[PDB]
């Protein structure tokens, strides 16, 4: 059922900074 409300206001697509994030482990092999 398409139960959809009315107060859906669009933002300004507010720009920010992702300065040092997104770093992860590229594979499942230990190094040191």
């Amino acid at each position: 059922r398409c139960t959809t409300f009315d107060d859906v206001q669009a933002p300004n697509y507010t720009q920010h900074t992702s300065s040092m994030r997104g770093v992860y482990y590229p594979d499942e092999i230990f190094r040191s």
Partner: protein, 48 residues
């Protein structure tokens, strides 16, 4: 998934739980994780 020839020994690792292999600073194996709950080093140069 690994064969070779080595001298095994108990480690001093801080091995993460999601993990299975233990390669060194310059891409060689040097430590492994046993499939029945052990984490042993792999000094594969027996002697040469």
């Amino acid at each position: 998934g690994l064969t070779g020839t080595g001298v095994l020994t108990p480690s001093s690792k801080r091995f993460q739980p999601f993990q299975q292999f233990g390669r060194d600073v310059s891409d060689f194996t040097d430590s492994v994780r046993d499939p029945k709950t052990s984490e042993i080093l792999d000094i594969s140069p027996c002697s040469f």
